[PDB]
Amino acid sequence: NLILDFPQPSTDYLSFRSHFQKNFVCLENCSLQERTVTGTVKVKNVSFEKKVQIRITFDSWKNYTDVDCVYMKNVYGGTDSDTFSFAIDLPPVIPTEQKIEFCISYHANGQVFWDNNDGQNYRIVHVQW
Ligand SMILES: OC[C@H]1O[C@@H]2O[C@H]3[C@H](O)[C@@H](O)[C@@H](O[C@H]4[C@H](O)[C@@H](O)[C@@H](O[C@H]5[C@H](O)[C@@H](O)[C@@H](O[C@H]6[C@H](O)[C@@H](O)[C@@H](O[C@H]7[C@H](O)[C@@H](O)[C@@H](O[C@H]8[C@H](O)[C@@H](O)[C@@H](O[C@H]1[C@H](O)[C@H]2O)O[C@@H]8CO)O[C@@H]7CO)O[C@@H]6CO)O[C@@H]5CO)O[C@@H]4CO)O[C@@H]3CO
């Protein structure tokens, strides 16, 4: 009934790297299971202290929620970037007319960086299936 309306950003490496180098934050993977959306976010390692959040709407941006992401230790990651994970429960019912979208914010060293997917956000759409 719901599906991701975007390719996994990490699949197209050249696009992923271009966005990540420009914005210093980029969604890496995302999956929709049951009524929960989970995923991973790559951020440039700008400073020790970081705050990474998903800003998500389930009602066409009438409202939104900021959800904290959690740092993921990665033995195989480099020292230039860090990985954060998120898990967000969907509301029990979302009417078909309502848009579901999210974007990502990243605070470090007094600055804020955004992944808004080239101004479209990351969309989840309603389907017949
Ligand atoms: O321990 C040395 C450290 O002490 C002081 O730091 C204090 C700090 O100022 C307070 O803010 C508080 O910190 C808490 C913090 O506010 C919370 O947000 C949370 O921290 C989380 C981070 O926000 C989050 O980003 C993630 O952290 C991981 C990093 O993302 C990842 O990159 C890696 O971190 C490495 C750093 O990137 C790298 O720079 C290097 O860090 C050194 C610092 O650069 C250097 O300044 C100093 O740090 C001092 C600091 O200046 C003091 O203010 O030494 C660091 C090396 O020891 O190395 C890092 C890897 O070791 O990994 C981290 C995760 O380890 O997740 C964390 C949540 O775990 O919690 C913080 C409290 O735990 O208190 C601190 C502690 O005194």
Residue numbers in the entry: 133 to 261
Quote the original article.
Dephosphorylation of both enzymes is exerted by protein phosphatase 1 (PP1), a pleiotropic phosphatase involved in the regulation of cell growth and protein synthesis, other than glycogen metabolism. PP1 is directed to its different pathway-specific substrates by scaffold proteins; PPP1R3 are those orienting PP1 towards GYSs and PYGs. PPP1R3C (317 amino acids), also named protein targeting to glycogen (PTG), is ubiquitously expressed. PTG is composed of 317 amino acids with a structured central region, containing a carbohydrate-binding module 21 (CBM21, residues 133–261), flanked by largely disordered regions.
